[PDB]
Design a protein around this ligand. Structure first.
Ligand SMILES: CC(C)(CO)[C@@H](O)C(=O)[O-]
Ligand SMILES: [Cl-]
Length: 300
C-alpha cells in the first residue's frame, strides 16, 4: 500500500525532513507493507484543502502548520497565543506533555488522526516597506496572516492591517504589492525563498509555530493495534526530525538571509509582548484561564 503524504514546502525544508523520517520509519517497521509517496510544494492545494482531503480519505498523510487547523479543532488555538510558549524547550515540553497529547486526542471526532506535534519554530515579521524596530513601526502595514484567528487578533493590537491568505496565494501577492509582508519562522523564510520577496526581517519571534503530523481515519481505523503503534512511532520520528532541522536552521538562518540581501533587525521583544497582551481580553472568551496558566507553568 502506497500512502500519499502532502505538505506545503520543498523536499529540503523541515516538512521534507519530517516526511522523509516518517517514510523511513513506517517502511522499516512494516517491512514495506506501507510506503510513503510525498507530494511536496503544495501540489495538492492549500493546507485547508489538504486537511479536507484527509477527512474524505483522498489524502492519507500530511504535515501542516496550525494556520488552517483551528477551523477543525479550535481548542488547539491556545498554543497560537503570542509569547505564551516562551522558547523552544518550553514549547516542546508543553506539546509533549499531557496538555499537548490531550489536544491530539481531539482530532478523531473530526475524522482526522493527529499522530504528533511537529515544529516550524518561532515566527518573525517580514515586509517590503520599512524596517520594523518597534511596535509603532508596524502600524499600518498590510501583513498577510494565516487563517488562524488567534494570530489575526494579536496583529490587530499593534495596528497591523491583516490579510488572511492561504499559502499558495502569498508569493504572488507579495510580488504584486497588495500585501506588504508576512510572518513565518526562519525555517520557512529560508526554504521558501522569501528573501527574494521581502526586503526586511525583524526578529520578533512573536509566536511559536507548531506543526501537526496528520493521517486519515480511513487508513488508520483499518490497522491492527501493532500497526497503529507503528504509525504513532513514525509520527514521533517525523516530529524529532523537524525539531532537529529547526535547531540547525536557527543557528545559520540569519546569516543565510543577510547573505541573500535581507536587512535584518533585532527588536525588543518585551515591547512587542506588552503591545499585544491586551488581546487576552479576546483569548479569555475562547480558552480556559487555568489551561493557560498550566501552560505557563510547564517546565523545561
Ligand atoms: C508556510 C506555512 C504554510 C507552513 O505550514 C505556514 O506557516 C503559513 O501558512 O504561513
Ligand atoms: Cl505524540
Amino acid at each position: 500500500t502506497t500512502l500519499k503524504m502532502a505538505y506545503a514546502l520543498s523536499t529540503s525544508s523541515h516538512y521534507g525532513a519530517g516526511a522523509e523520517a516518517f517514510a523511513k520509519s513506517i517502511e522499516g517497521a512494516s517491512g514495506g507493507k506501507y510506503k510513503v509517496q510525498q507530494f511536496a510544494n503544495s501540489a495538492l492545494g492549500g493546507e485547508r484543502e489538504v486537511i479536507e482531503g484527509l477527512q474524505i480519505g483522498t489524502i492519507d498523510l500530511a504535515i501542516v502548520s496550525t494556520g488552517a487547523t483551528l477551523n477543525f479543532v479550535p481548542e488547539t488555538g491556545v498554543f497560537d497565543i503570542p509569547f505564551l510558549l516562551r522558547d523552544l524547550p518550553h514549547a516542546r515540553a508543553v506539546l509533549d506533555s499531557k496538555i499537548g497529547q490531550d489536544m491530539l486526542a481531539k482530532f478523531p471526532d473530526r475524522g482526522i488522526i493527529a499522530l504528533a506535534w511537529g515544529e516550524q519554530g518561532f515566527r518573525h515579521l517580514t515586509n517590503n516597506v520599512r524596517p520594523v524596530k518597534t511596535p509603532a513601526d508596524a502600524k499600518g502595514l498590510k501583513i498577510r496572516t494565516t487563517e488562524n484567528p488567534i494570530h489575526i487578533t494579536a496583529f490587530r493590537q499593534i495596528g497591523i492591517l491583516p490579510t488572511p491568505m492561504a499559502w499558495p496565494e502569498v508569493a504572488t501577492a507579495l510580488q504584486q504589492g497588495t500585501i506588504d509582508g508576512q510572518e513565518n519562522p526562519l525555517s520557512v523564510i529560508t526554504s521558501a525563498k522569501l528573501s527574494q520577496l521581502q526586503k526586511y526581517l525583524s526578529l520578533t519571534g512573536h509566536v511559536y509555530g507548531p506543526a501537526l503530523v496528520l493521517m486519515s481515519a480511513n487508513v488508520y481505523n483499518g490497522l491492527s493495534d501493532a500497526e497503529k503503534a507503528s504509525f504513532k512511532a513514525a509520527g514521533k520520528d517525523s516530529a524529532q526530525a523537524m525539531r532537529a532541522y529547526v535547531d540547525n536552521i536557527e543557528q545559520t538562518g540569519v546569516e543565510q538571509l543577510k547573505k541573500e540581501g535581507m536587512e535584518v533587525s533585532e527588536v525588543d521583544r518585551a515591547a512587542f509582548a506588552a503591545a499585544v497582551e491586551p488581546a487576552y481580553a479576546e483569548y479569555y472568551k475562547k480558552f480556559d484561564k487555568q489551561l493557560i496558566q498550566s501552560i505557563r507553568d510547564t517546565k523545561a
